Design an enzyme around this catalytic site. Structure first.
Site, PDB file in Angstrom:
ATOM      1  N   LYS E  39      89.395  38.763  35.347  1.00 40.64           N
ATOM      2  CA  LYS E  39      89.972  37.052  35.318  1.00 40.64           C
ATOM      3  C   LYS E  39      90.339  37.052  36.771  1.00 40.64           C
ATOM      4  O   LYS E  39      90.383  36.426  37.344  1.00 40.64           O
ATOM      5  CB  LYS E  39      91.392  37.161  34.272  1.00 40.64           C
ATOM      6  CG  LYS E  39      91.480  35.536  34.442  1.00 40.64           C
ATOM      7  CD  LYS E  39      91.841  35.079  33.242  1.00 40.64           C
ATOM      8  CE  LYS E  39      93.405  36.107  33.113  1.00 40.64           C
ATOM      9  NZ  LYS E  39      94.638  35.568  34.870  1.00 40.64           N
ATOM     10  N   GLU E  65     104.759  34.374  32.481  1.00 43.08           N
ATOM     11  CA  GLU E  65     104.171  35.425  33.562  1.00 43.08           C
ATOM     12  C   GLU E  65     104.430  36.622  32.870  1.00 43.08           C
ATOM     13  O   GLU E  65     105.679  36.749  33.339  1.00 43.08           O
ATOM     14  CB  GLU E  65     104.133  35.578  34.436  1.00 43.08           C
ATOM     15  CG  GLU E  65     102.486  36.922  35.711  1.00 43.08           C
ATOM     16  CD  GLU E  65     101.354  36.030  34.823  1.00 43.08           C
ATOM     17  OE1 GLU E  65     101.111  34.672  34.513  1.00 43.08           O
ATOM     18  OE2 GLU E  65     100.756  37.126  34.548  1.00 43.08           O
ATOM     19  N   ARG E  66     103.894  37.465  32.664  1.00 43.30           N
ATOM     20  CA  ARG E  66     104.167  38.837  32.504  1.00 43.30           C
ATOM     21  C   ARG E  66     104.964  39.629  33.371  1.00 43.30           C
ATOM     22  O   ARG E  66     104.215  40.286  34.067  1.00 43.30           O
ATOM     23  CB  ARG E  66     103.335  39.745  31.439  1.00 43.30           C
ATOM     24  CG  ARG E  66     102.854  38.673  29.916  1.00 43.30           C
ATOM     25  CD  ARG E  66     102.148  40.301  29.820  1.00 43.30           C
ATOM     26  NE  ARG E  66     100.971  39.262  28.494  1.00 43.30           N
ATOM     27  CZ  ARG E  66     100.420  38.719  27.943  1.00 43.30           C
ATOM     28  NH1 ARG E  66     100.062  38.314  29.483  1.00 43.30           N
ATOM     29  NH2 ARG E  66      99.930  38.245  26.970  1.00 43.30           N
TER      30      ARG E  66
END
Ligand SMILES: Nc1ncnc2c1ncn2[C@@H]1O[C@H](COP(=O)(O)OP(=O)(O)OP(=O)(O)O)[C@@H](O)[C@H]1O
Ligand SMILES: Nc1ncnc2c1ncn2[C@@H]1O[C@H](COP(=O)(O)OP(=O)(O)OP(=O)(O)O)[C@@H](O)[C@H]1O
Ligand SMILES: Nc1ncnc2c1ncn2[C@@H]1O[C@H](COP(=O)(O)OP(=O)(O)O)[C@@H](O)[C@H]1O
Ligand SMILES: [Mg+2]
Ligand SMILES: [Mg+2]
Ligand SMILES: [Mg+2]
Lengths: 472, 55, 485, 485, 236, 121
Positions: E39, E65-66
């Protein structure tokens, strides 16, 4: 001296009125407010306390200003009763809306009145022939009984009634009361045309039916009272005149629907699904008044709406118990092209007994059900495998069943503009013999198509022969 | 020879069965959604109705 | 001043917040100036919450309120027999005042743990499908759960009709008085029901309590409790009673209405938290009493209304947990021709054979187990594969036993007529008969015994059991008839 | 500080505002704040008033000044709106200068009474064959356009507008049919490009556009349908005919359930308030055919509803169906198979079609709707591969030909005169012999045959609009002769 | 009035795109498929191509977001060349950690949008706005509206959901000055498209570039699936 | 190893409800996700400059009949970096530990696996 008050709050179809005087009007009473457009009628609902009351608007509350003066009527909303109402269109409030002058009636009774005593209850087991196959064969209606026509949207509840009025109201001999509760305003007008053309309602002459409307376009207060208005008129001819009356209501659901809109503003704790806690009672007081007594008989054909095609819904589910005959329409049947989309399985009546419709009639009917049932129980198999996997005995029952189902359909004179086929009126006597002949297996040669939208059993063999010449 | 004709038909029978049964799954799987969402919204309504309790 | 009186602060929806009444008790009856009575359920410093038994268009702010000083009770005794009363116990049939012997409260404590007896006395329901599979016992509560228009009331109704066999007798310990409790039903139906009872001379030992939908919610709520006290009476005087609730599903809806309106927080689906406690303290009131108490008893046939066949519902589960078994009725079986449509797979009796008649116990031992095997074989023969001798033999008999169980409404069958039929079934004498023949076979076989082998019917009736000799004669009587025609 | 026409803001949030004052304000009366934002007194309480915000609450500060308009929310109505794009308030958003309005009408009008009405009888050619054959629309009818995402819901409404150009450019008035498109909850680009297509086809001249983008506050989307309605009601009262299309009402209810939930209202099914019905109800009722005394004017409405997974059993959908005079469901499956428009004859319905359909089509198309209904039942029942008889097979061959004949490309409207011929052939069976892959080319080639030869027939059906017993024969001999070649 | 009256195609730089599911200039594109299909690799690509063909910058916005992935992303971007410290960067990063309160989570998107609109109205460029993932943006709102006391809509989502979605999607459009193309990922809750969040999101999407595992399994890069990838601008 | 987060949420739900805070899906307040996200994100791999230190997290979630679609699980599964889904069925067959290879996944994968085993795995 007229009792007067001032408005303190106005939220939607709910207006709070306050009275300076220490005398407060009871519940279920009417009120009037002066406006440039006319007069706005209110109805007491509950005493909030502090000489303040909560009422329900009967029309639009636009323009109402806080502290405006409010005049008391002194009695619950009443409506003219008597032969003078016939051939006239009465409003929820009880005033002419057909522009033909005021209804000069002798007496005027209130819409609110208590249900008949248990001792006054009179039971009857007389059959009522309608001409409808799927009915006079499976769930026949009873004279002066309660009729119910459940079904989702566009299944055939009104069109079903219209036919009942085209076949019973004509050869009836008594009086009729039609009340459109929360329905298309257009259907009311076209209904007026029909009554005039058929001659049921002659302006210059006399009429056989009264028209009371509380259409959906009207606010909730009206959609809630209209049913009561129409009923008051019909209970008059019942006790006072003691004559057979046909009470046609459509749609009765709007009654609870209209009450569930305001229950929130009234300050009631919403029950499951959003419906007001007192669903059972309100619906109770209504149905208990619509019944036959020792003074007169009344046949009521009430149509019930089914929200999201859900019969488990508290609204319709509390309606079955108040009916001597139930005719449910499944949209899953109408989509097949089968009309009326009556579901033989779900449909029930109290007259379906051999000690009334006869032993043979009982047996023929039962056989039709079993056959239809066996087709349904294998439906899962059919979509997966097919009929090739069906046993010899089972495969024969399916075809026969499918023949019986298609045969149930019947051309409606009122719905001729939809089917393009002239109406077909079938007698109960011929209908029984017809199916019985199909059960015996005397028409297993005739193609299924010949059973679709067919009237008399003779017309089946006739239509079967016409299909031979069309084959190329 | 008539055995080779059974296998041939039976190979067609179970082909359409997988197609109908298979496509039937893509239909009930949709009913499993609306029914899943219904239970999530209904259980939520009682929670809100129990907290909206005032005087 | 206000200790015995009070002024109304608000009123609506059958609820009335009266101010004052600082000496009124919990759940005490009261009377307004209008004439309408009411019931106090919520006790608060500011005001008292009262529920109306009648319309509220009569109560208005500032009205006077008076108290009764007594907990809502109802007249009880034999006098009520044949009369039709309302929640409060007043006559509604129009046949004079209720001549009662005593008056008992609505809410009564369930019988003690000490004063009890294990159920051993049968309750002839006249329904073969029932008395053979799920027998009823004097002192238990057998549920009748099912969807609308299935045959719930039917099962109950026929039972009362069957009692005519003993109530016309001289012996008391054998009779069984019946209490029908209509709740939520329309007056039209109740009228027709009571009409039917009279058409069978069953009204003389029957008491009816009416709580139609039109009446106020508090009436529908109180109806069952008062009605129970009526029946408890026999239980205490060493007589047997049979009460039928129809239906508790409506009662909860009613009781739900008082709660919501009294502004009491709802639990699940708006029902009050203690909704369980509504049916628990009701059904427990019926049970078999000790020999010291009178050997009296009260049987209960609660009725519930499921939606779409969903027994996993809130109210139904609440009651299934209390009742000594249930007679599940499926709509689908009704059309198939199984009438009454009793699903054996789901219908059970916790008292079991203890309650069943000893005679009928012998002829049908693993019959319920056999009908279980039938559905097991019936589903497996769906495959469309040939069946051997075993799987077809049981399939032949299992299919006919299901046809033998079918019995017409309003047609209760004595014990002496059930035993013979079941006998010829479990053994295998019907296997060699066509299915559409089982119908007339029943009637013909009965007429055969009543004419010739009538002595046997008389022994089974009195003895109630089967001796080594009675089996011999009964055996020969069956085979002899099969040979005929 | 006149607490009679102006007040102060007490609190603000959730899109609601509680102002103190305004003792002479009317229910649902337009108002304005110091910032210039327009509101509406949706409710009146003693000591405070509830106002909905038509703009962002950012602009509403606590303690500001609040003046009243003195008139209920209204929108400019007249012929000057033609070719002009406005919002929910009626203000121009296109930038072609202010709107030339003849008058101002309330945003909330009541539907015409029962007496001042007449049954519809004026056909409304949509340009679509499958439509004006199975479920035709008439002046004053309320035809619903239900279907899933990207199914061609607007494609049926859009082509209708472009087909009206054939009469809007004429001299006569009763033939012209004004159009009023309503866009609510849609994108900016989606509407802008939609307008552009109208200009390319020169259809914007006789069309009015009302905007309620998603970016705009919920209430705007709530009032957009009502106001837009009053714009077309004008033409009705003047004896003219108008046509309004809501795209879409399903989003509105979602926008309204917002304000509904924010104002703390007991949730209903799918979190929609109980009064959601009265929403679409009050809106659709304002579309019918007036009597001759009124002006013989009408207002045809085309509401649009978006379902999920082809679920017409949903709440919002059913509520609309119980108001509209027929539906035109658009199944996705048929849409992917090429069958476009993906009209599902099974669920499609017209409660007042034949009454407002050309007699030329009523004759040639008899029982075509019911046939197709039964068609899918036998077609989807023979798709297993099993062999059938001649009866079912014969109906299966003719069904397929009709199904393909119903197909039609977008932006390709056909005259009624051109549609009549096609239907005739389908029912008779002349197409049956014809190959399935030649049905498309055949239609375009058959029309040219009449124009080049039997043009007289086309001119007769045009004016007369009915097929006599003589023209019926001249037509048959003309098609049969073409089928052979 | 500032809106365009015609949708045009936006040349990306990928055959699988321009030929099958083309990107709409100032439209919303849906990117499906998690890690394993590259991705990230497909994202930095669109940033380079457009930077050379249209010369428009890009803006990456991470909602919830991680923190783990945020690190590896930043670092990877320096290795590819989309971001140079010494030279000139082409894309701006605006991450919104998951360990942040709903308040911040529901605004991250707007933060990145603002920066992007600048280069649209000032420099008038075809800027690309990347949002990952549009789903947590709806979830963010749901937690915020939850704490505020607002009553829960259907399925539990906020009533205001409908309006919020528009206060972000509408702002992303092609004006007379410049244009902003949105490339935001989409997550399907319980593999159900009937759900409000997805239902509402798709209502704005114009194209969808799906990334299947079975596509990268055949050695096909990018892992774009020709069958699933569809566009609303695929007409003559 | 957090065994188990499911129980933690229940506890927290209890406090939140008793304190009369807004109830969400399944009676969980909106900050329930902020709870676990602010917990799991605490574990990571510090860089060389920070100390190269590291904290691994193995949170345990108990589903109700395989329903991974529930509220709590959806939150956790969204935050973590892989699952070791276990099924009772696989357990009965004998496969112990019953680790559903089909569902069990790891986003890091080989990045953290011995090359000695990677060459055969
Ligand atoms: N044993 C039976 N055989 C044939 N028909 C029956 C039998 N019992 C009942 N029925 C029929 O079923 C119909 C309804 O029966 P019943 O009154 O028992 O249902 P119910 O459970 O009372 O439903 P409800 O509670 O709505 O009254 C009646 O019309 C009756 O004729
Ligand atoms: N008869 C037809 N033949 C071929 N294509 C068609 C036809 N009708 C519609 N389409 C195509 O379908 C596409 C989807 O647009 P359309 O407006 O019809 O969908 P919709 O369901 O109305 O969407 P929405 O409801 O969101 O406006 C159109 O761009 C059009 O090209
Ligand atoms: N007997 C019938 N035969 C054929 N169609 C019918 C029949 N009854 C109703 N319908 C269908 O119902 C439509 C009208 O719906 P209606 O009966 O008014 O539904 P509702 O019960 O919602 O009023 C018609 O288009 C017609 O096709
Ligand atoms: Mg109707
Ligand atoms: Mg009953
Ligand atoms: Mg559309």
């Amino acid at each position: 001296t007229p009792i007067t008050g001032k408005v303190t709050a106005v939220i939607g179809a709910i207006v709070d009125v306050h009275f300076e005087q220490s005398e407060l009007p009871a519940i279920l009473n009417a009120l009037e407010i002066k406006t440039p457009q006319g007069k706005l009628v209110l109805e007491v609902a509950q005493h909030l306390g502090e000489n303040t009351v909560r009422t329900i608007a009967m029309d639009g509350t636009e323009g109402l200003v806080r502290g405006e003066k409010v005049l008391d009527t002194g009695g619950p909303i009443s409506v003219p009763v008597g032969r003078e109402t016939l051939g006239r269109i009465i409003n929820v409030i009880g005033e002419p809306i057909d522009e033909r002058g005021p209804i000069k009636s002798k007496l005027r009774k209130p819409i609110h009145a208590d249900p008949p005593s248990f001792a006054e209850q009179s039971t009857s087991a007389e059959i009522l022939e309608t001409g409808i196959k799927v009915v006079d064969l499976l769930a026949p209606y009873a004279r002066g009984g309660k009729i119910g026509l459940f079904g989702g949207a566009g299944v055939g509840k009104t069109v079903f009634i219209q036919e009942l009025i085209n076949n019973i109201a004509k050869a009836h001999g008594g009086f009729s009361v039609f009340t459109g509760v929360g329905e298309r305003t257009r259907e009311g007008n076209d209904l007026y045309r029909e009554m005039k053309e058929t001659g049921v309602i002659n302006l210059e002459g006399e009429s056989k039916v009264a028209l009371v409307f509380g259409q959906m376009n009207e606010p909730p207060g009206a959609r809630a009272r209209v049913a009561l208005t129409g009923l008051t008129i019909a209970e008059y001819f019942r006790d006072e005149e003691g004559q057979d009356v046909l009470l046609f209501i459509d749609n009765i659901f709007r009654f609870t629907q209209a009450g569930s809109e305001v229950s929130a503003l009234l300050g009631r704790i919403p029950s499951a699904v959003g419906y007001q806690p007192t669903l059972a009672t309100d619906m109770g007081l209504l149905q208990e008044r619509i019944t036959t007594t020792k003074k007169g008989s009344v046949t009521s054909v009430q149509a019930v709406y089914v929200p999201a095609d859900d019969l488990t819904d508290p609204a319709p589910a509390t309606t079955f118990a108040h009916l001597d005959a139930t005719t449910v329409l499944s949209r899953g049947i109408s989509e097949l092209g089968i009309y009326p989309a009556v579901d033989p399985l779900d449909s029930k009546s109290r007259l379906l007994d051999a000690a009334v419709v006869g032993q043979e009639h009982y047996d023929v009917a039962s056989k039709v059900q079993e056959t239809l049932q066996t087709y349904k129980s294998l439906q899962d198999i059919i979509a997966i495998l097919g009929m090739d996997e069906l046993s010899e005995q089972d495969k024969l029952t399916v075809e026969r069943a499918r023949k019986i189902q298609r045969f149930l359909s019947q051309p409606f004179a009122v719905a001729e503009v939809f089917t393009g086929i002239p109406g077909k009126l079938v007698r109960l006597k011929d209908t029984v013999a017809s199916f019985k002949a199909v059960l015996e297996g005397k028409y297993d040669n005739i193609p299924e198509h010949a059973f679709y939208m067919v009237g008399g059993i003779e017309d089946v063999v006739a239509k079967a022969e016409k299909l031979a010449a069309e084959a190329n | 020879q008539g055995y080779a004709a059974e296998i041939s038909a039976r190979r067609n029978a179970m082909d359409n069965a997988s197609k109908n049964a298979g496509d039937m799954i893509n239909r009930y799987s949709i009913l499993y959604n609306r029914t899943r969402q219904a239970v999530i919204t209904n259980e939520l309504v009682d929670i809100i109705t129990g907290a909206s309790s005032l005087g | 001043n206000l200790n015995e009186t009070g002024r109304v602060l608000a009123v609506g929806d059958g609820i009335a917040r009266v101010f004052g009444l600082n000496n009124i008790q919990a759940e005490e009856l009261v009377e307004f100036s209008s004439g309408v009575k009411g019931m106090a359920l919520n006790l608060e410093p500011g005001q008292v919450g009262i529920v109306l038994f009648g319309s509220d268009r009569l109560v208005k702010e500032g009205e006077l309120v008076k108290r009764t000083g007594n907990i809502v009770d109802v007249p009880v005794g034999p006098g009520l027999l044949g009369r039709v009363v309302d929640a409060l116990g007043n006559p509604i049939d129009g046949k004079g005042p209720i001549d009662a012997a005593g008056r008992s409260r609505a809410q009564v404590k369930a019988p003690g743990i000490l004063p009890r007896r294990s159920v051993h006395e049968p309750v002839q329901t006249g329904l073969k499908a029932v008395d053979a599979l799920v027998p009823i016992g004097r002192g238990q509560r057998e549920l009748i759960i099912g969807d609308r228009q299935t045959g719930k009331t039917a099962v109950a109704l026929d039972t009362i009709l069957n009692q005519k066999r003993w109530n016309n007798g001289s012996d008391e310990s054998k009779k069984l008085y019946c209490v029908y409790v209509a709740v939520g039903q329309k007056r039209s139906t109740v009228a027709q029901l009571v009409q039917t009872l009279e058409q069978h001379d069953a009204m003389k030992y029957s008491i009816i309590v009416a709580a139609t939908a039109s009446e106020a919610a508090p009436l529908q709520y109180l109806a069952p409790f008062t009605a129970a006290s009526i029946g408890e009476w026999f239980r205490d005087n060493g007589k047997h009673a049979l009460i039928v609730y129809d239906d508790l599903s409506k009662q909860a809806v009613a009781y739900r209405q008082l709660s919501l309106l009294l502004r009491r927080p709802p639990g699940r689906e708006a029902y009050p938290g203690d909704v369980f406690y509504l049916h628990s303290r009701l059904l427990e009131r019926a049970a078999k009493l000790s020999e010291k108490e009178g050997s009296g008893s009260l049987t209960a046939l609660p009725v519930i209304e499921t939606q779409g066949g969903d027994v996993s519902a809130y109210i139904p589960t609440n009651v299934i947990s209390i009742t000594d078994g249930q007679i599940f009725l499926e709509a689908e079986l009704f059309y198939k021709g199984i009438r009454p449509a009793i699903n054996v797979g789901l219908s059970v009796s916790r008292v079991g054979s203890a309650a069943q008649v000893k005679a009928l116990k012998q002829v049908a031992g693993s019959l319920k187990l056999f009908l279980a095997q039938y559905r097991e074989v019936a589903a497996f023969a769906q495959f469309g594969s040939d069946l051997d001798a075993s799987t077809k033999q049981t399939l032949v008999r299992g299919e006919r036993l299901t046809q033998l169980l079918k019995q017409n409404q309003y047609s209760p069958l004595a014990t002496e007529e059930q035993v013979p039929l079941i006998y010829a079934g479990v053994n295998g004498h019907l296997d060699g008969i066509e299915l559409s023949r089982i119908g007339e076979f029943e009637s013909s076989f009965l007429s055969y015994l009543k004419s010739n082998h009538n002595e046997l019917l008389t022994e089974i009736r009195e003895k109630g059991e089967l001796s080594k000799e009675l089996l011999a004669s009964l055996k020969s009587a069956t085979e002899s008839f099969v040979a005929t025609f």
